[PDB]
Each structure stands twice: as structure tokens, then as C-alpha cells.
Amino acid sequence: MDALELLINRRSASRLAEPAPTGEQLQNILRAGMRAPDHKSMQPWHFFVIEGEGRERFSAVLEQGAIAAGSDDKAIDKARNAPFRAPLIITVVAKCEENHKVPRWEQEMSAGCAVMAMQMAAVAQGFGGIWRSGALTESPVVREAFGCREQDKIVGFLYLGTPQLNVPDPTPFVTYF
Amino acid sequence: MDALELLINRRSASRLAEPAPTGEQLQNILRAGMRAPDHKSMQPWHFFVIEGEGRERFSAVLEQGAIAAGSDDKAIDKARNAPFRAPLIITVVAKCEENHKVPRWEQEMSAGCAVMAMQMAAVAQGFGGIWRSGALTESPVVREAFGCREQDKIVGFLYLGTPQLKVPDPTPFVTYF
Ligand SMILES: Cc1cc2nc3c(=O)[nH]c(=O)nc-3n(C[C@H](O)[C@H](O)[C@H](O)COP(=O)(O)O)c2cc1C
Numbered sequence A: 001m002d003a004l005e006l007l008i009n010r011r012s013a014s015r016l017a018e019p020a021p022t023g024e025q026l027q028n029i030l031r032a033g034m035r036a037p038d039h040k041s042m043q044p045w046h047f048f049v050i051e052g053e054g055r056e057r058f059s060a061v062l063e064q065g066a067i068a069a070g071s072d073d074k075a076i077d078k079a080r081n082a083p084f085r086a087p088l089i090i091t092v093v094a095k096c097e098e099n100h101k102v103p104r105w106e107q108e109m110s111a112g113c114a115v116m117a118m119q120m121a122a123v124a125q126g127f128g129g130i131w132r133s134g135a136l137t138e139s140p141v142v143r144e145a146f147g148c149r150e151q152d153k154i155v156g157f158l159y160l161g162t163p164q165l166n167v168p169d170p171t172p173f174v175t176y177f
Numbered sequence B: 001m002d003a004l005e006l007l008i009n010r011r012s013a014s015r016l017a018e019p020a021p022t023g024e025q026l027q028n029i030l031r032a033g034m035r036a037p038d039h040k041s042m043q044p045w046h047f048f049v050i051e052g053e054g055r056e057r058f059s060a061v062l063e064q065g066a067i068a069a070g071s072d073d074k075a076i077d078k079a080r081n082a083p084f085r086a087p088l089i090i091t092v093v094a095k096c097e098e099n100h101k102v103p104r105w106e107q108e109m110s111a112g113c114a115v116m117a118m119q120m121a122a123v124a125q126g127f128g129g130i131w132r133s134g135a136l137t138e139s140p141v142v143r144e145a146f147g148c149r150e151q152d153k154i155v156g157f158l159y160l161g162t163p164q165l166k167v168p169d170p171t172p173f174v175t176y177f
């Protein structure tokens, strides 16, 4: 696939199904993430691969987090069922470290860019996915499940799988200095 | 170039020179930027294209900002000459709005992703680019120059142009849930 094409036509897919990326195709996605912009080369991030059985555990953690958050049954139910919307979910956590001419937000930024890079790496390989977050990224139980320290932050839950689904116009968003 | 290849070998290039991407080449870069992930499609960004004489005013602003921040001689210097390190610069501002369903940081990361996408679009076309920031992204006069409101944020100064000069291992970064 052409790189420029990938970027200009990039799209997120929410309707995902098996097969999910695996073997080298999955490692290629993880490798793309490692190439995200990174101020001072701090590699401020960690990836969690959630497939098959993992989804069950991930389900339980999210439901627990919702309960603890004081969410109503409707919310708790949506949380418990969240993981089963894709065959694979990659959680991205920004692993930050005290300033280094690099404020915390920039380190979190790099981790974020990693999520997009991986989403694109899935597309480049015949797969697809969508970057999701939600209030549960701030849940203590959820954070603990992904080893979040005080300065760490869950930047996204990347849902991936085989998708089953006019030229962009940037003029309204551009100004010539 | 090959998509996967660009994602797995994405590199930033400092030390850039004339000519800068123009016409469809430049539009293709702005088009990629507006295809970044966007929670609730808020399109929380604005792209400031800086080139030619526009770089003089940018220089004046940065310089004024450094002096105001109390930076030393050498820092104020690098600040004033900064804009001339590339023929083209695109400043990306995160234009944030209260959403309740989309916290501020999520809109900021979408803008941040636009920068990466724009840097990649440049590379996909044979050009080079580097995402820069520094303490001046917070400077009142610089922010004022790019129409930043209290909730807006300068996420990066993307240097673009023609580059010079002629597989990662994610194992330690991957946890299997
Ligand atoms: C939010 C953000 C801000 C950055 N700011 C700077 C900067 O001011 N100066 C710089 O040399 N690199 C900066 N970087 C890092 C470069 O874009 C680039 O990733 C790094 O120089 C390593 O080169 P590579 O991208 O080829 O690995 C920043 C990265 C991010 C994500």
C-alpha cells in the first residue's frame, strides 16, 4: 500500500471481527508504535496486548472499575461488554519520568502518537481498528491492572481486527501566517 | 513509498533546506493532518503555515518570548534564528471546546496526532520534517501570536523542507494481558 494514500484516506473501523493481527503482523503493529515522535528519546510508553481469554479478564476489570466509579447498571453493562467488540485490544500507557527539557504532556503525547501509528500499521496490513478511551482510563482499578504509577496515564484502548464494512478539505482549518 | 515501511522506519530529519513542499505537495500534508483521530469529530485544531518573509515575524515573536521568559543570551539567540532552520514551518494549535464526553487532553492529542501525520505525509513525498516544541510553546506572546485562547495549546512547531544526508525490538515494551 502507498504511504501517502494511507495517510490521506486514514479511517477508523469500529465493526471488527476475526481474524485479528497475529505473529509478525502483530509485531509489525507494535514496531510502528515504537517509531512515534519522541522528545529526547525517552520511549515513554508501554503496550498491553489483550487477545482471547485476556478479553475476559479485561472485561472483569472494566466492570469492576465502573462499579467503583459509581456508574449505573447501564454503564456497568456497557463496560463489561466493551472488550468483546474486537478480537484484539492493545492498551497504551504513557510511562512518564520527571522533566528532561520534556514536560509531562509531551511524553504523554508520544504515547498517544504510538496509538495512531499502530492503528495505521493495522490498516497497512489489511486490518483495521479504532482508538477508544472513556472515563475508565482514569479508574484506579483499571490503572492498577495496567501497572500505572502516579505519573503514568492510559492514553487509549486500541481495538483491532479485520474490518467488515471525497478528498479532505483543510481550508477551514488553515491560516497563512 | 511502502506504507508499512514508512511506519516501521519513520524518522525525523533536522537540518532541512529548500525547496519546501508546495502546491499539491503542501496541500497533501495539510490533508493528512486533518485525518488524525478525533473523538466526537471536534476537529480541535488549526494549522498556521509559515514560510518566506513570514519567518521573520515568527522570529521576532520567539525572540520577544525568550527575552520575556528571562532566557540567557545564547537561548535568546537560538530562539531568534530558529525559524530559519527550515523553509517551511507549520504551527499546530489545539483549539479546545468543553465537551464533557471528550476531556481536554483528548482534543490536545488529536492535534498532536495531526502533527505526526503531517510529518509523515512530508516523508511519504520525499521531503523531511521534525516536530519541535520547547518552552516557548507556553510563551504568552507566542501563544498570543497564534490566536491561543485560555483553553488552546500550541502542540508543536513542525519544520519541513528538503532533507540532506544520504527494525526495532518491542519485546521489553510489550506485556501479554
Ligand atoms: C510533543 C513532542 C515535542 C517534541 N519537541 C522536540 C523539540 O523541541 N526538539 C527536538 O529536537 N525534538 C523534539 N521532539 C522529538 C522529535 O520529533 C523526534 O521524534 C526525535 O528528534 C527523534 O528522531 P526520530 O523521530 O527520527 O526517532 C518532540 C516530540 C514530541 C512527541
Ligand SMILES: Cc1cc2nc3c(=O)[nH]c(=O)nc-3n(C[C@H](O)[C@H](O)[C@H](O)COP(=O)(O)O)c2cc1C
Pocket (backbone or CB within 6 Å): A010, A011, A012, A013, A130, A131, A132, A133, A134, A155, A156, B035, B036, B037, B038, B039, B040, B041, B105, B106, B109, B110
Ligand atoms: C485520545 C483519543 C480518544 C478517543 N476515544 C474514543 C472513544 O472512547 N470512543 C469513540 O467512539 N471514539 C474515540 N476517539 C475517536 C476515534 O478514534 C475516531 O477518530 C473517530 O471515531 C472518527 O473516525 P475516523 O478516525 O475514521 O475519522 C478517540 C480519539 C482520540 C485521539
